[PDB]
Design an enzyme around this catalytic site. Structure first.
Site, PDB file in Angstrom:
ATOM      1  CG  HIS A 182       2.174   0.226   4.512  1.00 51.80           C
ATOM      2  ND1 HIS A 182       1.951  -0.644   5.562  1.00 51.80           N
ATOM      3  CD2 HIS A 182       1.019   0.920   4.349  1.00 51.80           C
ATOM      4  CE1 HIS A 182       0.715  -0.483   6.009  1.00 51.80           C
ATOM      5  NE2 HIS A 182       0.128   0.456   5.287  1.00 51.80           N
ATOM      6  CG  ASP A 235      -2.053  -0.934   1.177  1.00 53.12           C
ATOM      7  OD1 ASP A 235      -2.110  -1.699   0.189  1.00 53.12           O
ATOM      8  OD2 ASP A 235      -2.858  -0.968   2.148  1.00 53.12           O
TER       9      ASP A 235
HETATM   10 ZN   LIG Z   1      -2.612   3.265   3.270  1.00 57.10          ZN
END
Ligand SMILES: [Zn+2]
Ligand SMILES: [Zn+2]
Ligand SMILES: [Zn+2]
Ligand SMILES: [Zn+2]
Lengths: 206, 206, 206, 206
Positions: free
Chosen positions: B163, B9
Site C-alpha cells: 500500500h 493499493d
Molecule cells: Zn485496499
C-alpha cells in the site's frame, strides 16, 4: 565534538529563575518546552529564557493526551502556543516537544500535519526519571537524578529530558553539568538552523 | 525467468512521488491500483505513474465492503474509477484489484458481471502485511516488511500486495528491490496483452 | 544492575504452561497480569505461576475500556480480581496493569482511588506489539517480536509488555531471554517490597 | 531418499477412475482430500482410493470460505466429512486439507480447535496451478502443468497440490510421475504414523 542538550518541559514555573541562574554561572545553554497556560502566567521568565541564549519551544496548550492525539489537536495546540511565545520573544519557534512523547500518539496523519505546518518534533535520548522522586527529600533526590543522567550519557549527542517545575530536577542540574563536562560534553541550546532528527518514530522529516 | 510484480493499493497519496522516484532509481516497473477519490485529488501522480511505465488499474470508489459486495456495486464502481483514470492517461485499464481481496466478497454473480464487463481481477501471492506495521519506528517497520516479502518470494511469478499510502511501506521498497534482484527477479508492470490469472477463486476467466 | 521485567497480560491460557516451562528452563522469573475470567477457568496455572517464583497481579475482570475508565469501575474490578487470585495463592497482590495502559483512561479521580485503595499501577517501557503479529507464520512472527524487544532494551530497568495468550508471543520468549542475557540483563519478577513507579502519568504515588 | 506426495483436492469426480488407473500403472501411491457431497455421490471411488493404497482425508462439506473460517465451522465440517468417509472405509482419517489453504483463514482459535479435535492440517509446498488451464486444450495444458511441478521440485519432501476434478490435471500426472522419478523421488501416500508438519502457519501441532 560531544554535545549535551538539556531540555526542560512543562514550564515556566517557580524554580525556573533559579535554574536560569545556575545555567548562567556554568555558561551552559539549554532548551525549554513551554505550556501555553504557563507562558501566559510567566511572561518575564519566557523573555528571560530567550534573552539568556536558551531555545524556547512549544509543549502544547492543554498537555491533554486525548485532545492532542486521538482528537488530532496536536498541531492546532502547538500553533496556538507558538503565537503566545512569539508575542513575547519576537519570533516563531518551530520545534515542538510532544507531551508524553511522540510514541504512539503522533500517528502518521498527525506527522504529516506537523511537517505541513512547518514544525519539527524532538523527543529525547535520556530520561532523567526526575518525576519518580517527587515530594522526596530534595538533596538525595537530586543526586539520584544526576546519576540517572550521568550513567546514561554514552553517545556524542544526548538530548536529556527534565522538568523544571520539579525542585529536585533543578537541584540536580549542578551535578549534571559538572559530570557531563568531565565526560567532555559541551552544553548547547537547540538551533533551528542545525536541526537533526530526534524522535521515536525515526521520521527524518521531523 | 523470474518476475516480481510489485502492486500498490489505495493511492495515490503523499508518499507516492517518493515511491515513483525510488522505482525510477532502480529502473523497476510496478502496478498501481487506485481509489477514485485519490485519482481526483492527485491527478498529477496518476499521470506520472502511467508516464513512467507503470500499470495503472482500479481499486474502486468507496473501498466499502458492504457496497461493493453485499450490494453488488463492484463492477459499477470499477467502471467509474476506470473512466476517471482514462480521462487522465488516455486509455481504459481493464485490471481491477478487489478491496479486501476477492475472497469471499466477489461471489459468482459478481464474477460473472466482471467477465461480462471485460474486466480482469488480480488478487496476490504475497501479502507484505505492510499496513499492519504502523505502531513502530518507520525504519524498523520497513525492515520487517522487507523481510516478509523477501522470505516469501519463492515462485517464478510473485504478485506482491503493498500500500503506497503508508510511510513504512514506501520505506521498505529499496530493500525489497535489492533483495529480489539478488534472488534473480525482474520488476515488471502488469501487461494487459500478457494476462495470467491470479485470484483466490481459481477462476481463470478473470 | 540491569533488570528486565517480562510482563505477560490477559492470561492465563492454553500456552501458559509451555511459557512457564521455558522460563523455568532459563531460570527466569517474570510477572503475570491476569483477567478474572481466566483466573476462574485456569486456577491450576495461577497457582503454578506463583509456586514457581513469578509475581501474580491483576488485569481486571472485563478488560472493557468503557466500564473501567468511562464508568470508573477500575478499582472495583481490580479488587474483585484480587480476591479471586487471593483465594488461590493465599496472597492479596497490590500491583495492577491497566487494560490498554493507564493513558488516558486512568484519570486523576481514578488514580486517587487507586492510591486510597492501596493498589499500585504498572504500565511498561517496551511494547513488544506481540498481539499484532497474528497473520503470519508463528516462527516468523516470534522472530520479529524478539527483534522489537531486543532492539529497544537499552535502559537499566525495562518493563516489557507481552501477552501469554498468543502463540507467537510464547514462541518469541526464548530468543528474548537469550538476547537480553547477552546484553547483561537479569530476569526478575516484580517485588512489592521493592516497588518503583512505572506509569505514563508520571504519578509516583502508584 | 526424497519423497513426493501427490495430493488431489475437491473430488472424487468423473476423471478419478482414470487417475487411479494411472497411479496403479506406475506403482504410485497418493493422497486424496474429498468434499463431503462428492463422497456421497461417488462411494465406489472412495472405496477404491483406500483399497489401492492411497490416503483418504477431508476437504470439508461446503468448501465455503465464509462458513469455514469467519463463521468458524472448519472443525464441524471436517468432522462431518470424516464420518462420511468412515462409513465407507471403516476408519476415521485425521488429516484435513483447508479449502483455499490455511492462511489466513485458520486463525489461532481455529487451530486450537483442530488440535483439540485430534485433526491434522496439510497445506502444500508445490502449487501445480492446474486451474489456470481450465477449459484449454488438454494436451498442451497437461504439459505446462507438468512443467510447473517438475520445475519447482527441489526439496527432499514435496507436497504437490492438484485437483483430480480437472481433466488437464489428471492428464499431467504421467509426465509428472516420469519426471520426478528421474529426479530420484518416491511416490508415497500420507500416513498418520509418518506425520510431519506442512502448513503455512508453521504450527507444529498440526
Ligand atoms: Zn485496499
Ligand atoms: Zn510534559
Ligand atoms: Zn490486556
Ligand atoms: Zn479445494
Amino acid at each position: 565534538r560531544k554535545v549535551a542538550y538539556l531540555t526542560f518541559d512543562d514550564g515556566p514555573g517557580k524554580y525556573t529563575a533559579e535554574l536560569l541562574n545556575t545555567l548562567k554561572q556554568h555558561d551552559a545553554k539549554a532548551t525549554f518546552f513551554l505550556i501555553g497556560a504557563n507562558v501566559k502566567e510567566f511572561p518575564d521568565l519566557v523573555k528571560r529564557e530567550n534573552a539568556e541564549g536558551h531555545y524556547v519551544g512549544m509543549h502544547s496548550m492543554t498537555h491533554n493526551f486525548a485532545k492532542l492525539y486521538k482528537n488530532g489537536e496536536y498541531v492546532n495546540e502547538m500553533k496556538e502556543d507558538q503565537g503566545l511565545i512569539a508575542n513575547i520573544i519576537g519570533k516563531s519557534p518551530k520545534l515542538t516537544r510532544p507531551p508524553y512523547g511522540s510514541m504512539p500518539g503522533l500517528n502518521e496523519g498527525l506527522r504529516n500535519k506537523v511537517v505541513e505546518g512547518g514544525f519539527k518534533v524532538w523527543d529525547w535520548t535520556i530520561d532523567s526519571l526526575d518525576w519518580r522522586y517527587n515530594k522526596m527529600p530534595v538533596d538525595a533526590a537530586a543526586a539520584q537524578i544526576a546519576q540517572n543522567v550521568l550513567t546514561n550519557a554514552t553517545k556524542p549527542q544526548e538530548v536529556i529530558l527534565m522538568h523544571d517545575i520539579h525542585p529536585q530536577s533543578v537541584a540536580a542540574v549542578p551535578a549534571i553539568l559538572k559530570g557531563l563536562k568531565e565526560k567532555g560534553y559541551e552544553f548547547e541550546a537547540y538551533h533551528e538552523e542545525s536541526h537533526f532528527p530526534v524522535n521515536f518514530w525515526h521520521d527524518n522529516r521531523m
